[PDB]
Design a protein around this motif. Structure first.
Motif, PDB file in Angstrom:
ATOM      1  N   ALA A   2     -27.861  53.581   1.853  1.00 36.60           N
ATOM      2  CA  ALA A   2     -27.906  52.251   2.485  1.00 36.60           C
ATOM      3  C   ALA A   2     -27.639  51.195   1.415  1.00 36.60           C
ATOM      4  N   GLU A   3     -27.437  49.952   1.838  1.00 40.02           N
ATOM      5  CA  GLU A   3     -27.237  48.811   0.917  1.00 40.02           C
ATOM      6  C   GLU A   3     -28.531  47.996   0.904  1.00 40.02           C
ATOM      7  N   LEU A   4     -28.905  47.509  -0.279  1.00 38.42           N
ATOM      8  CA  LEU A   4     -29.997  46.524  -0.479  1.00 38.42           C
ATOM      9  C   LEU A   4     -29.369  45.125  -0.443  1.00 38.42           C
ATOM     10  N   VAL A   5     -29.532  44.401   0.676  1.00 36.70           N
ATOM     11  CA  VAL A   5     -28.813  43.107   0.924  1.00 36.70           C
ATOM     12  C   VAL A   5     -29.695  41.882   0.685  1.00 36.70           C
ATOM     13  N   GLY A   6     -31.018  42.024   0.701  1.00 37.55           N
ATOM     14  CA  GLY A   6     -31.918  40.866   0.660  1.00 37.55           C
ATOM     15  C   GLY A   6     -33.211  41.169  -0.064  1.00 37.55           C
ATOM     16  N   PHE A   7     -33.665  40.206  -0.858  1.00 41.55           N
ATOM     17  CA  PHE A   7     -35.001  40.248  -1.496  1.00 41.55           C
ATOM     18  C   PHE A   7     -35.613  38.851  -1.445  1.00 41.55           C
ATOM     19  N   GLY A   8     -36.890  38.805  -1.057  1.00 40.72           N
ATOM     20  CA  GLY A   8     -37.679  37.586  -1.020  1.00 40.72           C
ATOM     21  C   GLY A   8     -38.991  37.808  -1.726  1.00 40.72           C
ATOM     22  N   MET A   9     -39.436  36.765  -2.413  1.00 39.98           N
ATOM     23  CA  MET A   9     -40.798  36.602  -2.921  1.00 39.98           C
ATOM     24  C   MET A   9     -41.254  35.219  -2.483  1.00 39.98           C
ATOM     25  N   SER A  10     -42.544  35.088  -2.278  1.00 39.13           N
ATOM     26  CA  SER A  10     -43.215  33.780  -2.139  1.00 39.13           C
ATOM     27  C   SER A  10     -44.643  34.016  -2.594  1.00 39.13           C
ATOM     28  N   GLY A  11     -45.341  32.961  -3.014  1.00 37.47           N
ATOM     29  CA  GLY A  11     -46.806  32.979  -3.160  1.00 37.47           C
ATOM     30  C   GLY A  11     -47.437  32.277  -1.977  1.00 37.47           C
TER      31      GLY A  11
END
Ligand SMILES: COC(=O)C1CCN(C(=O)NC(C)(C)C)CC1
Lengths: 412, 412
Positions: free
Chosen positions: A255-264
């Motif tokens: 598969a493809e890794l298309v998105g990454f998010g972080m927040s506090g």
């Protein structure tokens, strides 16, 4: 400029198996890996069960002489890393060893080792502390020992963001490749916190299920009768690889890794906000990062810890992000079966999210007998659900209000 | 393309002082912060000395109640972080809080808390373990507590790369800003491992100087009579900021962060290769990242731990990278004065590298009475050397062969 990132190898130790396929078989059949703990006497503890790795043979990977020096969390992290690298088909050479790094994290690291050495110090004296106490216990030594064994000279680091560790490790490893700092990364996490201090410490916080008389039913994400998370052990590792690099060597792409998010959250040291505000911000960052309409999301591997406040925060976050589409996607917690692998949770769940895409099936939330107030989404209660999945999302939240989201999609 | 990153705030606890200007005054005066460790029975230990933080008042930062919940390493990290944010003049608002994040790390984390809770566990059983044991001990709680205290909603994470932690934390935070994932990051590291477990653990590996008779002479990088590193406590925090963001609000800019390099030795768990091939790759990676020729480098803040093999590897690495410029640059180890703050080493040394640029002075390597075989560079023996410094490097080379290099340049 930003390169594309694909998954070419996966590796795992879980309470359901000593590799990926055996673990995944357990996930699709709704099997619990949770059982009374056998490796120590828990009669003084309020929780006496968890997800142990059963029958782990470290001499499938390492000489008994090396294994003796290493905390179980390092042994588990190396085993998953070795599996992932073998599964990728990648050969390490002088031409590419500088372009292959590792980011294998842990929430707590070598607590068993540190406990055992603390007992030696107090009962005997400092002369009985192992010479290997530091390199055998500290969290960066999965990355360290993997690089030494395979000759990886690329970026070499470790995250420790509590229950978000595996997701952050994988996300940041993808950014390393995205931005040209590496072409290949081995990334994930490992945990073995099932010692006195671990079970005692989470016990002192009253964070754990105390369902000692029915351990396989203890982990019940979104069930009205949930009473805390179940503590579990193991490791997940993925080989992340620049797309053209994978294409050039004829790699099998999962598969493809298309998105990454972080927040506090910036809310509380340990409690998630009831409205899921930090989780919502994190998923929105991840969907924007992936260039996606939220309606494209087919499956969510929830954090889904089986805590009262955690589970309901996630429903609120998903409803807020997805609006009416929140009723069309499937969301499940594989922690219903594996329990909470802490720093390794995001790593094993990233693998389950990729296999959901390969096999076109949503894993079940087992034990979901009586969904709680407002838990009225498709939570895949009891049984695996075959269905169309183009886009899968894996969420993690942790202490310190730390949030991670990974977005995977099918690759053609 | 990429955004430029500047330093607008610094904060520190060290064995030389409870802030930056007091610590820096000791550095330029060649003062030692090393002394016998007090309020602790080290009779059975082969090392009885280290760099302690002297006279730290946590109630300048936290209520007594919030401080009781947090390991000393977390308290020290919050103190440096608070100082750095105050020093920057930054105002957090609803308009920018999603663009302000934290990456404060530690090498070894909560050994003092682990020690004290082990006492309770072994003596009285698990029901005497503190409820805040886990959240009060885990490495990502400096980032966690800081984010909650200031309402920071940007990237929230923590690195743990042993003695490389503070360098990697600052570098990866600079990357967050450069690639538009944040406008501001608080970054660095904190450490308190002058517990029985740190002194005992490193002591059992025989990694420590045992020069108990003359603690201030113990740390003697590149001196033929060195016999291992000195263990030290404290914290460094920088406010990293996108250049246009810093200029728009009229921030005081100390220096620009132009370069970040990483590498793995893939050699040994605790010892570098003799030629320092990994440290050379890392420094070359950092210069390529900054678009600079090795000739443009004026000042190197060495790792310089006072280990026999570590010090010699760094000479080899510098001669390899810099060739006919190797003698013209100045290289010093402030660990001669501070000892080795492990995960916080790279943070306080980044601050000293920035101050070398502001004040046009190379800090001394004290105790360098008899340079060893091949240690014939300008190691700034005994006394601070005023000179032209346009470009400063800070190196960290840690367990698992994990390497970090930061490149700072004068800003005008
Ligand atoms: C009570 O709520 C607040 O937001 C106050 C908290 C106290 N204070 C700071 O700690 N400022 C530093 C970090 C620059 C030292 C200002 C902001």
């Amino acid at each position: 400029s930003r390169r594309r990132v694909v998954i070419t190898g996966m590796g795992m130790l879980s309470p359901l198996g000593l590799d990926v396929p055996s673990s995944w078989e357990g996930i699709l059949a709704g099997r619990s890996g949770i059982a009374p703990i056998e490796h120590m006497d828990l009669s003084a503890y309020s929780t006496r069960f968890g997800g142990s790795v059963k029958g782990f043979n470290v001499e499938e990977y390492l000489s008994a002489k090396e294994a003796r020096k290493l905390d179980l969390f390092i042994q588990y992290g190396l085993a998953a890393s070795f599996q992932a690298v073998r599964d990728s088909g990648l050969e390490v050479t002088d031409a590419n060893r500088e372009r292959i790094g590792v980011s294998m994290g842990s929430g707590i690291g070598g607590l068993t080792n540190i406990e055992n050495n603390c007992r030696s110090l107090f009962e005997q004296g400092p002369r009985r502390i192992s010479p290997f106490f530091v390199p055998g216990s500290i969290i960066n030594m999965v990355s360290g020992f993997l690089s030494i064994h395979l000759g990886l000279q690329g970026p070499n680091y470790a995250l420790t963001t509590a229950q978000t560790t595996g997701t952050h490790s994988i996300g940041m490893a993808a950014r390393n490749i995205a931005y040209g700092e590496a072409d290949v990364m081995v990334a994930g996490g490992s945990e073995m916190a099932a010692c006195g201090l671990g079970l005692g410490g989470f016990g002192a916080a009253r964070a754990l299920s105390t369902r000692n008389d029915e351990p396989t039913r203890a982990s019940r994400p979104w069930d009205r009768d949930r009473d805390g998370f179940v503590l579990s052990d193991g490791s997940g590792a993925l080989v992340l690889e620049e797309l053209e690099h994978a294409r050039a060597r004829g790699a099998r792409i999962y598969a493809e890794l298309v998105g990454f998010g972080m927040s506090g959250d910036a809310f509380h040291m340990t409690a998630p906000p009831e409205d899921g505000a930090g989780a919502a911000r994190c998923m929105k960052n991840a969907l924007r990062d992936a260039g996606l309409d939220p309606r494209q999301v087919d499956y969510i591997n929830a954090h889904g810890t089986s805590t009262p406040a955690g589970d309901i925060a996630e429903i609120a976050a998903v409803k807020s992000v997805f609006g009416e589409h929140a009723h069309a996607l499937s969301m499940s917690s594989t922690k219903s079966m594996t329990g909470h692998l802490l720093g390794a949770a995001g790593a094993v769940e990233a693998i389950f999210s990729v296999l959901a895409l390969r096999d076109q099936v949503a894993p079940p939330t087992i034990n979901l007998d009586n969904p709680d107030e407002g838990c009225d989404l498709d939570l895949v209660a009891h049984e695996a659900k075959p269905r169309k999945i183009d886009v899968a999302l894996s969420n993690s939240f942790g202490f310190g209000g730390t949030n991670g989201t990974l977005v995977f999609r099918r690759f053609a």
